[PDB]
Design a protein around this nucleic acid. Sequence first.
RNA 1: AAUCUAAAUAAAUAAUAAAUUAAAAUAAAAAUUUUAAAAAAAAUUAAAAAAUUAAAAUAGGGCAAGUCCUACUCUCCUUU
RNA 2: AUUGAAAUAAUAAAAGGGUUGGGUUUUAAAAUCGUUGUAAAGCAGAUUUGUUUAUAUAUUUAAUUU
Lengths: 300, 59, 272, 351, 158
Amino acid sequence: GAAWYLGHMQSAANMLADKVKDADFILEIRDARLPFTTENPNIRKLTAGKPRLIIFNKAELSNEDSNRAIQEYYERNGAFALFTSARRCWRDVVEAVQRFTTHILPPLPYKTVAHVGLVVGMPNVGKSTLINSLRLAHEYQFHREDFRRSRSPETVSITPGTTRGMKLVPLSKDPPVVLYDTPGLTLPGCFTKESGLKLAACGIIPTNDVSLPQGMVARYIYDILVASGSSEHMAECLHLPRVPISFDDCVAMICERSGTSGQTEMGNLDPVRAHRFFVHDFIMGNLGKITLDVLPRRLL
Amino acid sequence: AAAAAAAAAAAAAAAAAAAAAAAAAAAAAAAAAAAAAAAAAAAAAAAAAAAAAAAAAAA
Amino acid sequence: VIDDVNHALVQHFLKLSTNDKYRQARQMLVIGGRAMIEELCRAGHRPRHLMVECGKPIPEFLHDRRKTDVVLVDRSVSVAVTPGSDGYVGDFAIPTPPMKEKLIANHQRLNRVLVLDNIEDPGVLGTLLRTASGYQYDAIIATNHCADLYDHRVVRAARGAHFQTSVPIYTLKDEDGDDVYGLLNHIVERNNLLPLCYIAQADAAGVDGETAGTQTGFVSSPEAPVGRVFRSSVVGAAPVPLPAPRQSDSSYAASLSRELASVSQAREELLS
Amino acid sequence: LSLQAREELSRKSNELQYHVVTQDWFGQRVDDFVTQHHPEWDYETVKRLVQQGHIYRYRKNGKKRYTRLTDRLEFDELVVVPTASFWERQLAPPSGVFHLSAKTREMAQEMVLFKNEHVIVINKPSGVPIMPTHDPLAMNITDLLPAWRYTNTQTPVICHNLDTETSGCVVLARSANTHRMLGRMFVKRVVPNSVYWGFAVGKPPVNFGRIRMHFEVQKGQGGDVIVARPTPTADSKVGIAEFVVNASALEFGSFISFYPLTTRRHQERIMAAHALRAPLLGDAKYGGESAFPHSLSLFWDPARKDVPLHLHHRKIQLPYKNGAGEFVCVTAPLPPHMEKTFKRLGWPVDA
Amino acid sequence: GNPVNKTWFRHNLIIRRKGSYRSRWGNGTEGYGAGVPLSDQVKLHCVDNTNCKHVRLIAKATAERFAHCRVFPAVAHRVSVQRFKGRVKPGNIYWVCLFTRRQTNTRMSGLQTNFDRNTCIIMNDQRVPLGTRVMYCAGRHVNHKYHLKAVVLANFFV
RNA sequence: AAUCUAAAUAAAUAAUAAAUUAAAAUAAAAAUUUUAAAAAAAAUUAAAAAAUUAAAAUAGGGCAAGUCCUACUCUCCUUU
RNA sequence: AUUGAAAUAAUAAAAGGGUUGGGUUUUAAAAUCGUUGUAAAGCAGAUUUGUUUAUAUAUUUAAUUU
């Protein structure tokens, strides 16, 4: 029974505060295709004053018009924002944390202590892989905890479960900007009817099951893109009469790599092999490089 | 079957109540149990005094 | 708080206030009245479901198991199930008088009876019930098709009369030929077992003895007349009794402005 | 305990020392000495202190003779019997130191499946809570309790708090003496003592097994998970159930039977929402977001909150037995909301 | 103690008949009580005019035959269309009024019978059909007042 | 469906304290019970099943020391 | 004073089931080789005075008839 933290996030607030009461610079790993669904609910009232380094991953597939406003929004509030294609990997995102403190850090009173970094975000959007990439390499090349790297028991090699107490990853050394873990507080599974669509749309929570069939997100990625064009160019990419009238033809027109047991005279193709295609291809930013969220021009 | 033979879950004869604890033969074949008053496994099912009626509490 | 006219307790009172079959089948009757309930409550009677309207007047002189369900009701249902300006409405347990004391313990002299024969109208029907009792009349009676003596308008007109403050009232039956020619013979001739008769208070009047009695009564004259009708019919003449005195008024009066003139002094007080 | 006997040694209190005079009281049983000198404590309140050790000892010689209730006194040793007077302090002294209209006193009597001189078993309606949450407002069982006081017993005591959305069978004890006994029947079983029925949507893994999850209640409502296969050992307790999928909708639902060996919070529903990730039908608190009712041919109008959680506390094996030797097993029949989906599926609802 | 029985619930909703040279199913083709009441997900064909696949409709209940009395079965059935139109969903649980079956079911007049494909029609909770028209030949066993007074009694029976 | 009897000939193997038994019920011993006791009435023979009898004071968690392990600043007899 | 250390993750041997608590369970080729029960000793003109009963369910439905 290996589930995760399960409960409304708006009750994980007064405990998140005392976690920020001691931290210095707040981080976050989001998805630029989902500027405010991958955010914790308090992002508004979370800190308002600690220097946030809010990062949007997979930005190369998120649209560029909505990228400007979301950039200058926090950039007006003061809290910074950085967008990355992730092809140039987190190694450059790490470089940001080397630069995005030297300019904004308050000078350390004691020459070598830390810059205690509070990280948040969904573990499946890039926050896990960002920790366990810097957490694994610290075991070999050593900065603190000062022991001979032998006491890690059998079958762990990593510990993001059952201890996660004072556990923290030293990302840098001379400006030792360390980073916390924040035991995963996001995607509560009590999500909204629609948020699970935009979440499974982006490849996040890639589970497509009885809880969320392909034909429920595929109906969503089709009806979101009612403007046929540069998306019908993916349809026209597979012999489609450009405009699809509705969900029946376009999904059935793309059954060239789909099908099941059908007669030699009347073929009864398979619309689920066409479902996953239309679903999973939009995940790759292949069909269109367009966001999902609405980007409130107002403050909210 | 007239001759009978429909024995209960065990008890044979139960004596008078004498307050909360009522006796019972529990004839079956052996016992093991305990005892609230002095807790020692006490094979002697030939006589088990239940508490108010809870078969959980005995002798 | 019940802001819904579909509530069981609401539909309870309606079919208890207006319907008359499913009244006795539960032996209940709706009472309305802020002071009219305590009047009945004073002489040992507790409403089953006392529905106060949700508001200010909340006297609790019998609370804490006043035969509870002391429900607070919305203004909206205070209009529907309650024709009546009270914020204090309930329902009570039907009493009963025995149909045999009309037939056996017919006491001789001071026996003046009322009848009230017609398809009547509440308010008026209730009013007479208050005043007939208001002079200790015995054997107040029903007819072919008078309104039920527990109707909500009747109990509003009776104003504490229906319950046994002093009321040996009675109710009569339904007979074969869609009529009540057998309602009288079963009792009324036997209500001449004790002797005298009259048929006043009919819009039309005949013999008209007309309020002219001289002798103080020959006080020991152990016979005494009975009640009257409402409309004009000779149904009161097909019965065996040969008395036929249909009384009228004197001045320009009209309907209902004849009885309370008659019953006022045509009651027991012939001693004057 | 070694510290409990310390403060007992270092407490003046008033330490009502009680001599045992030559004539009247030397020889009498101690429980006679206390009960005719201290009329304030009930006798049962006097047995607890005399046996518990927060006792009225007796002191003759240089040590304290803690005693059973029947130990008799000594031949005028002026053998003082010390009794406690200001227990309140670090001691933490022991236990003992609206109106229900009809349509309720009747409603609470159709919810009775079994009654004898020692318990009362009821059939709780799915959706009525037990503890009050809107402290003046909610109609719960504890406010109803002075309705099952059949035969004028003293306000039955609730024994195991069924949850809000959980339907089913409850047990009250009719006697504060029986309630002490009926504790060992609930907490942390080894073998099952109760059956929970439910309609989880989605055929789980193998239709027999045991679930061991390690719950952790972070306030508010954190509700954590397996995190440690052994335990976090500090804030975690485990909840074990032996589930059996009695029958199964072919691949989209199942009728599961849980035998909850433990007593953890929503352990039925949180372990059901991660036995597969197939939660119970209408479980909007832990699962419940797959769809509104998880999108079936059931009553599907409001849905968003229409379908009540198909979870039912089905059977409890009481320890009181019956005229025939069998122990008694209440069999609270399913609510219509489960009788809906059982007959809509044609299963033989076993009452 | 005494693990008296596991699942115990299939035995309440299945027609289990021992095999003991006297109790035994048989292939049909012997007499009434033909055999094999078709107990699993069997993917019946739909026939009435809807978007039920008419080629696939997956089974729910563990019993289907008239010598097992389809006349009071309340046989649930789940719809699994391999395609409907690209009006029902491919995910709902409708009852079914079984029409015929390829299994050679012997009647009580020796009239053996078997059709090209086992088919059925979806109906509702009040036992009313969901379609307007039916495209197959039903079996005599659909004559009960159970599935008549709402069933169109489509056309030529057998 | 198909192949693998029996009897005839030939003959090994592990095992073996012996019983006067052994059906069946039923209480009695630091005990775990091989017996004994009351109460019963339990027949040969061949065949086939394995219910019982003839093959370890164990499995799983929670603790603490130990050997194994790595590491040398301080230890002993190394030899090379 | 005279070597000093490391959850040295596994082994071993112990205990145990305000500091303090998770675990609940018992086996892997069986000529049966003692009882057991199952069947049997092959044609009896013929059940059954009395032994002994693996014998086993009493209802979840549908459609009528008042």
